[PDB]
């Protein structure tokens, strides 16, 4: 991989955006917002191809001069939605100069919905079949964009895959040059190769080779030692609902502290649940004998 980074808030100016330069996974959310003096020229040579996954949500608000995300996040494949912004895993709001999304590698939003609103230049929305990305599209809120108040000339590559929406077959794409990838039904959420060969049952969205859990772009369940696993086996603990960590790691976060991390139900979690207390030294949550101190 690249690097597992914490959740970030990037505002006012682009200088801090270079902090993403080595992340392949954002273990948290990604907020890019309130950049009023930015112009397209400031984004021309700006790219984060390392980014494959965001465990929580992606929020974009009032970023001036940004016209597409095709160059910014070309390989973002999965938004897990472990933690959501107002029940959304993707939020594009008041992005005044955004013309298209262009997240041509986005295959799955594992939990949560989409909110794309008040983006007056935004097209290539009608060309996205969200049913292939989220199970819950009924809760999507996609309104007040260029497509609503004017006639977008959404020209797809021509050629491009075509899917149905209320009896009408429509070609699906992210930009004028990028189609929406669609896999055979049998591949389910696992993804497939260009040739149509299904990825391993433990993959999510895509893989470098078929039927191999060490060749996944992202995991359906848990990640451990470069492999997509179904469960974190003992002595490993499930962490952030996506990876396996050892006792040592979980202990060093507890002592670094933020949250003083604990062990409960084979998970390394921020706090003991209600009715439980932290048994000192072994970090294990044990039930309270009467009320909790």
């Amino acid at each position: 991989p690249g690097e597992v980074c914490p959740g970030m808030d990037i505002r006012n100016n682009l200088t801090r955006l270079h902090e993403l330069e080595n992340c392949s996974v954002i273990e948290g959310h990604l907020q890019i917002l309130l950049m009023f003096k930015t112009r397209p020229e400031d984004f021309r040579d700006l790219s984060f191809p390392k980014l494959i996954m965001i465990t929580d949500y992606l929020l974009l608000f009032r970023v001036y001069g940004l016209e597409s995300l095709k160059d910014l996040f070309p390989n973002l494949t999965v938004i897990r939605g472990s933690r959501l912004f107002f029940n959304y895993a993707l939020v594009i709001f008041e992005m005044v100069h955004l013309k298209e999304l262009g997240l041509y590698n986005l295959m799955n939003i594992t939990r949560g919905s989409v909110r794309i609103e008040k983006n007056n230049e935004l097209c290539y929305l009608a060309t996205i079949d969200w049913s292939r990305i989220l199970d819950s599209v009924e809760d999507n809120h996609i309104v007040l964009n260029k497509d609503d108040n004017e006639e977008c000339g959404d020209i797809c590559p021509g050629n491009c895959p075509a899917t149905v929406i209320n009896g009408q077959f429509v070609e699906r794409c992210w930009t004028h040059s990028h189609c929406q990838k669609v896999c055979p039904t049998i591949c389910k959420s696992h993804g497939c190769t260009a040739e149509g060969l299904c990825c391993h049952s433990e993959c999510l969205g895509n893989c470098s080779q078929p039927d191999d859990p060490t060749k996944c772009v992202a995991c359906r369940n848990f990640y451990l030692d470069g492999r997509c696993v179904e469960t974190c086996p003992p002595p490993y603990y499930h962490f952030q609902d996506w990876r396996c960590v050892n006792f040592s790691f979980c202990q060093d976060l507890h002592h670094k502290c933020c949250h003083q991390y604990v062990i409960h139900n084979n998970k390394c979690i921020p706090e003991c649940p209600s009715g439980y207390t932290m048994n000192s030294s072994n970090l294990l949550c044990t039930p309270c004998l009467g009320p909790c101190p």
Partner: antibody
Amino acid sequence: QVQLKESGPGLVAPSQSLSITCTVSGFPLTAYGVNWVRQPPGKGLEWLGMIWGDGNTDYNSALKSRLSISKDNSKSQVFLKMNSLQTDDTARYYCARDPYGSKPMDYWGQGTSVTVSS
Amino acid sequence: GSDIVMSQSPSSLVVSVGEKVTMSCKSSQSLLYSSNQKNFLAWYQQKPGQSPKLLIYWASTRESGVPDRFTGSGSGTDFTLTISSVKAEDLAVYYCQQYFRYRTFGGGTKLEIKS
């Protein structure tokens, strides 16, 4: 396309140390675990030890005192080393892959017959 | 704590072709993982003069390329391997195993067939 192959002595003098090399193919030793399981003549399978992708080792409590498991990921090999052998250590030694977190030992080696004698 | 002890019953059994067969497995502790509500238990078939073959994992999930006649049952501390209609090719030794914490095999069940 997964293969595991044990290379061992056949014959060991008692009190001497036994050294077996399991050479794996078709998968990365950094993602998979490898076990050592032995089987005395006409007896059942005995789990000896295991080595996780991250290099961590786990040994059979009865034999921990005499066992050593190591590996070379680059050479795709795992090494078992057993000290001060006796006649009851005469068995067929197998190395098997552990897809830990998904399946138990799935692919096994054909074995290595190890005899302790005169 | 104290390492996981595995039992099997019977040690050996002699059955005719086409007969149903059920062999037992006991664990000293629960193999039931809270996280996924699955048991860390395996069944292996070892034919004479061959290395073992995984039949069952997760106490009831049939391994790839395992005939339908092989059925793994149970939860926590008790498990059973069932062969609905024994075939001549089933002559083998069957071993249960924990992979909950480390691995421990039960002393096997030798299944013999009447000619």
